[PDB]
Symmetry: D2
Subunit: 332 residues, 4 copies
Amino acid sequence: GIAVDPAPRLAGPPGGPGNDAFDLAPVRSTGREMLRFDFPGVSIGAAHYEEGPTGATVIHIPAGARTAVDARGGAVGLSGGYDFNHAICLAGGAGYGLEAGAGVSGALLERLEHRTGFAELQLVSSAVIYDFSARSTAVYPDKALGRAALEFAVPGEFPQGRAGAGMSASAGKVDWDRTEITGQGAAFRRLGDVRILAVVVPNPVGVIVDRAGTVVRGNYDAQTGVRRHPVFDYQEAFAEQVPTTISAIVTNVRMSPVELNQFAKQVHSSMHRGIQPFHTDMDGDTLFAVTTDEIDLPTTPGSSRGRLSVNATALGAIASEVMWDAVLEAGK
Amino acid sequence: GIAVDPAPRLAGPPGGPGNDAFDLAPVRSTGREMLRFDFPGVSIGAAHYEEGPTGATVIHIPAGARTAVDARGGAVGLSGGYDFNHAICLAGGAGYGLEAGAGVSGALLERLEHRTGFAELQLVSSAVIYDFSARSTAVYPDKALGRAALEFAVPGEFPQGRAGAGMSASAGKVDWDRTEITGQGAAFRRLGDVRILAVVVPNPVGVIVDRAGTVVRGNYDAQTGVRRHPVFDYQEAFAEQVPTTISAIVTNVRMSPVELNQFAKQVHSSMHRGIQPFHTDMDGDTLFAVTTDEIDLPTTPGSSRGRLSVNATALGAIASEVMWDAVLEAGK
Amino acid sequence: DPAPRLAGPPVFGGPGNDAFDLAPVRSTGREMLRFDFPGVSIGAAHYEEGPTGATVIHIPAGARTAVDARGGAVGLSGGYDFNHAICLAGGAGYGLEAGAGVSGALLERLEHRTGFAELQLVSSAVIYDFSARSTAVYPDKALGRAALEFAVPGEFPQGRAGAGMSASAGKVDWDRTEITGQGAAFRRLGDVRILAVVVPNPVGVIVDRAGTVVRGNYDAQTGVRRHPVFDYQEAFAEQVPPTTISAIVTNVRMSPVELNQFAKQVHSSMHRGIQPFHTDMDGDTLFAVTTDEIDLPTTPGSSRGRLSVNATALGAIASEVMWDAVLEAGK
Amino acid sequence: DPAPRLAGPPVFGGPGNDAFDLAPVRSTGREMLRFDFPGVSIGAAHYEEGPTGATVIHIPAGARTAVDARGGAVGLSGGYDFNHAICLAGGAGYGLEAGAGVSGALLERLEHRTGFAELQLVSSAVIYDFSARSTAVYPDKALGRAALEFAVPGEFPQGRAGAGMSASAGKVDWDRTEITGQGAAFRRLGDVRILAVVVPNPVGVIVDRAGTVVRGNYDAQTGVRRHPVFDYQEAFAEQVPPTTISAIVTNVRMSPVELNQFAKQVHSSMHRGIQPFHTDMDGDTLFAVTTDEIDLPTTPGSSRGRLSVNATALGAIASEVMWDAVLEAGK
Ligand SMILES: [Cl-]
Ligand SMILES: [Cl-]
Ligand SMILES: [Cl-]
Ligand SMILES: [Cl-]
């Protein structure tokens, strides 16, 4: 059970200098703690500019992996969106921060010795959060930051908390006076040979909610010292006036394109448990579902626990709980 | 707080005669209780065949209303899917049960005196659940049943429980030995002049879960007398072997097509709180978001409860809680 | 240029299904196309009282399907990724009932078995053909049942037959709209089979490969058909300021991604023979169906070129089979 | 038939961006199109070292946009429903970097303000143009910045210019692929303005309105271009068994649903001038952009017909402006 910290992390009231105002040196992000996991073939790197503060987080899978993209929000900021990726790049800096993905792409082209055959094309999908209201600069994750995240990527490690894309992520935006800093978060599970890793950068309009139904991050009211569910503010506002989260889930279980896409949708929708409201017009919510195609499900779905108990739906259910864990690490 | 009944309603272990084996007479469904609400312009009718047992539930809005359709599942059964509807028809009988919608359509053409100008076209969207494993007949909602639901429709009333499309709906299908009968369910809220009505026929692969996180319908294990979360069965199955919900939300608040579509997605995803897992490959999950375009939101979204507190996202949040209530009435 | 078939002014006011004792007629159209495609049957039925009809493609074994619903006024039921039949019909929204007739009849043939892997799946799409006649009659359950019962292997009745009974083209102004028809074409290449079925009811006109307008937007004042774009641009100079439903069925194995992209390609290709097309006023809908009997080779090469045997290539061949079908429809 | 411009065999092995001191060149192409469209600017820049380039449409006030991404190999960034610029580029995936250069330069012009309603939005799409040259050079940040800086109102450099520097057509076999170009066209009708920009790098060929293949799939053995479908069907007889990126910019107000359906229509219409099109091998992507300055009348009638002034009608006019653009590209 994740020990979330009850103390407030109000982001504060929302120009400022841009990138070239500074001599920007990428910092390898360590965050508050390192998650360690065992998943050969998948590396994660995180880098930030302290001058933002803002960052990027890169998932490198050099073999390339089949990918489904679930771009559910109404304000999505997305590059590539490919159904096969060598890397995924998550970044702050809103639409400007997609540039970090170009830094990754360029650097992978260089590792391939600038080979450009169709089958050699290095494919990176990027998505962004708007993290500018959480700080007083206009610094964004650029080319050099994306390359540095890629260079910093190591297998079996993830920096929890204020790190990479999560450096100035924040939640709960009915009013900015009640918005709190979140983080990024990851969690991982091995069942048999099955491996599931979840990565998340929740910058939601809504709030982070734990399995008991407590609001644990975002919409902190300084006048009461309490975090209410946004619906309460929304209903009072209506009674008076009338009259983004970016994520990845990576598994080693083979799924067809159709399965993987429905998997993506299932795990994504499940995140409305831990973030509320979710998939709003104001959110750019995007989830990447990625399989390394290492392990087959059985032909038939049966087990002592039910006829319909082993299949891609079952794995979605299990992966959804890994994701919830990741959202809670980010809000911790 | 909805007093769900803890007693089990196991559906039982899953041919049988079809429609014409019987002299099928539509029954006006009354269910276990009538919800009463005030929403001029929207009528609901429910009819069933006792011989199924199976039913249909029809939302008649004779003025016609702008509609967004969120067909999220992997096994959707849908007819029309129109962005403007005179009626919505929900039915059992799987794909065969879309015929009820044709019964509605034909009967509306007759009220219009068979006028067929472009602007006079009567538009009905239909969606279905597969409810055949809950009974031992092959009877399905037909033309005559849809017409009878339409004829039975009255304003300001909804039959809760085993009624209309919810007559043989059931939940929790990791194994059919643990599947329970659900129902249909509705709930309604008036804030100021704003009216929100929710209607739901949850026939999920997953289970119905209340606001405290208790599983309250589906995946009842007769050997333990308890309902576990499906994830527990799924994880045990994996450790061992390796190595549909149809709904409507109707409001009187004007929304543009773009808003209404994102509204649909938001409220739909929120239902993964009350049904888990949701939006799976095995589900045909479909939500209809409908506005009668009677009341404007304010131009600006501000209030004493926050700068971003009155808008279509806020209304999604409020409508999501009306929907949860409706899912709980269905599982009650 | 062919003789005109102007629809004439729409005479709304007329009797609907309940006013008649409606008798299904097996459509024979103007001529029969004969082809060899084992496991595919086609049945066509109409009511003279409309006149209006439905055309059903029956594939008993069931076949994977991709759906490209492109217009802004689509009228579609099911849209399944696996189908035992496809139902095309007039009657606008109301003709979606014909498909329920097919679904019901198939269930009876399956002796009312209902296990999740035995459900009989029918996708249906419709055209609005009310303006081309003076009744409110639409293809109902019984007419869908009749078309399935009338289905035989390797025949297709061309012209005013089934769903093509009252299809029409060229709707810049109703005074220049012409009756079309339904149309089919078939090509076999080694073991590769491609059947194209089409029911054009376009806002636009049918155009042949020389760029001639061959059906729709015929001006009785001048004796000549015009491309709609000439009417449109003149309309704009003056005032500012002052559906097609189709199936492509083949026996080549394609993955769901491949078949989907193939459906999109062939569908777009039809803007060569119908113009304009995929408009907000159309409900254009194409079903791509494969019986999954023949493999494409593992690599795409041949004496005709390195990227010459693949799904895009089939796309291109099928696009011509489809253009032939549209032209039969308009003939 | 025009003289051939065969690309020649792809000579992979060559130097990339880091091997050069890359100097942006303002593209002038083969000739300048001049037009009058207040509030729209176009800038084009290339590196000779590729050769490869980027073309940027700048709309300072920002404009509503619909995106139709149709191919099975799309390479797209942003895809926003509101844009201050559109960036088209070679370099395949890698050329999406040019758009980040534009985004960065716009931010500087906005003095680094970052409120949610002042974000500078750039959508970018790319073609793979590596096979048409012998280097790995791609349009980078600086090249995107250069094209935005080079932007002026009412000019468009036709031909090998900007993103069209190494665009090519006709990819049944690389030995028959021909260099294309980029192309634009402009039509004004009363106050109604329509600009069409296109960068065809199709697997298919460019075809004119008479149905002639005018660029791509040229056989040096015979001196003649072929429609790909002839190669494909012969390939199949033998062996079984044995991208275009574009913008349509107008000043007419359309609702988001209207503009979207309009984008889809115009995009499909391009299967008349490029064949095949919307294939799984293409990343075909079209941006429909409106400056929202002129209203369509409330009802659609005119002396040219009852349904003659509306968004479908604009669709049809814009489809011809676009075909002119493709032909300029291939010229
Ligand atoms: Cl576990
Ligand atoms: Cl309330
Ligand atoms: Cl049969
Ligand atoms: Cl500017």
